[PDB]
Write a protein that binds this ligand. Structure first.
Ligand SMILES: [Ca+2]
Ligand SMILES: [Ca+2]
Ligand SMILES: [Ca+2]
Ligand SMILES: [Ca+2]
Ligand SMILES: [Ca+2]
Ligand SMILES: [Ca+2]
Lengths: 150, 146, 150, 146
DNA sequence: TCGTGACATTGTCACG
DNA sequence: ACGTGACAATGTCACG
DNA sequence: TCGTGACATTGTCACG
DNA sequence: ACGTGACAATGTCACG
């Protein structure tokens, strides 16, 4: 259980979630007849500032087929809300070319590491360790001295 | 370089106005609520009919929004025709801010694209293994002779 | 307890031990007066074939100062009598030069091994293992091939 | 090459006869017990006097024994003058029959003395270590470079 | 006591 | 007739 | 339920 | 005026 969830803000989250889905053409309520449907959506609107009210509206009006989706959306908001306090916990999306993504995904599977982790590997193994041509030479130089004339 | 099928495009254009309106934005370039709403109310009826949409746009849409709508719509075209073939389509990936930085900075330097750089990191490293699987095998033949 | 000691032969051993020491000028008996001394030695002589008799003669006449020495001599006879059945158990004495003995004794101390064992070491380490000049060469021959051009 | 001090030597000679007699040997070159014993009885009285011993020997000692006495006495001289200095004295050592053989055969081959051979075995081997403490140190410097 | 290894003493032989 | 190496047989002693 | 990582969709910007 | 890379913000889903 990483994050503290205070209903006041979480509640406000769903309120906006609901109101938004409604504006995008979705049956927020669980009422089969349009009459009561619009009669419930109108009450949801005037619940803007009241947090205790929303949770109730959900219990007696929200479309049950929204439940899981709303939870999953609220879980994202929580994590993102907290992970936003600092930058190192913040995520950044980088949409790159297919063929490229694929070649990068393969490694993530042939190493079992995370994408964001595999990207770090390539940054180190290549940028930090660059002296394997000379090592091949010098090592023979030293061996030559002991294994031959001195 | 993409074909802009005004029929489909006029669609996107419609939704954008609607959507923006339904979000509380100024779809009109007026002041009062009278002629304002009337514009919208009329735009709503342009559902199936495209040729009439543009008509409304040119005579009502807020100049402010017009700027954005252009980019937005222009953006849809690219993505639209891109998803017509999987290899021409880009996929989004997430990175830990720190991980993103190391990569971003690295690319901004070489001047190449994020995707470009990534491709580089893969080869630069798998080229190094050419040595790891090199000096390691030699040292193994060395101890074996003893 | 390695060897079986049957009084009959052991007894005969001491009988000869005693009789011998007497002939070499030693007070076999524990009798202070020569009179009884010769009177005891004469009885010992006629005990030649009788084994049970000897052990008794020892108990009432033998010089106590002979005890330990006789035991130590009899312990040698036992071991030697048995160890004589076969050759590999038989010992062989080799008197060699001082300076030589010394150099050989040193090794026996710097290895904590037995003389007869140290002599075996020298026979093996020198006679059996004679190929350390070529090994120094060939080993470089092989290393040269892998560590250089092939 | 040793000096044979007849005085001391005549001593050894005396004891030998006595001892041999006391062991049941024929100290005389006779047949019957009469003149035989009388010879001995007389020899016993030659205790302190040496010059008289030889006298008896030449006229009584068994020819058979005379052969041995010679070697025996001649053997004492060597040992006697040898023990006058520790480095000139030899010390006896025991070996397991098998161990003795390996050494004996080895020497009978090179034609040299047991003591000689032993000296050889020591050097031949400590010369080998010149390599054991050689190739071992090189192989240790070899792995260290890796 | 016991077994054992390291020596020691004495006597022969054989060989050079 | 010798000096000598190699034994064989025997006895002690100090260990463990 | 929860946290999480992998994606996806949409909308802007800025730049060439 | 466009195609485009880079985001930001948001939503889902399948894991464990
Ligand atoms: Ca000891
Ligand atoms: Ca010989
Ligand atoms: Ca023991
Ligand atoms: Ca997953
Ligand atoms: Ca850019
Ligand atoms: Ca988890």
């Amino acid at each position: 259980m990483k994050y503290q969830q205070l209903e006041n803000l979480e509640s406000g989250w769903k309120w906006a979630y609901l109101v938004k889905k409604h504006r995008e053409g979705e049956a927020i309520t669980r009422h089969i007849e349009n009459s009561a449907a619009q009669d419930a959506v109108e009450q949801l609107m005037k619940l803007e500032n009241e947090p205790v009210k929303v949770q109730e509206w959900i219990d007696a009006h929200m479309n049950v087929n929204l439940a899981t989706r709303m939870k999953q959306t609220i879980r994202a908001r929580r994590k993102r809300h907290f992970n936003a306090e600092h930058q190192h916990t913040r995520k950044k999306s980088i949409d790159l070319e297919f063929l490229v993504w694929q070649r990068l995904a393969v490694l993530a599977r042939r190493r079992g590491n995370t994408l964001s982790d595999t990207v770090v590997q390539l940054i180190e193994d290549a940028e930090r360790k660059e002296k394997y041509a000379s090592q091949m030479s010098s090592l023979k130089q030293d061996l030559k001295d002991i294994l031959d004339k001195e």
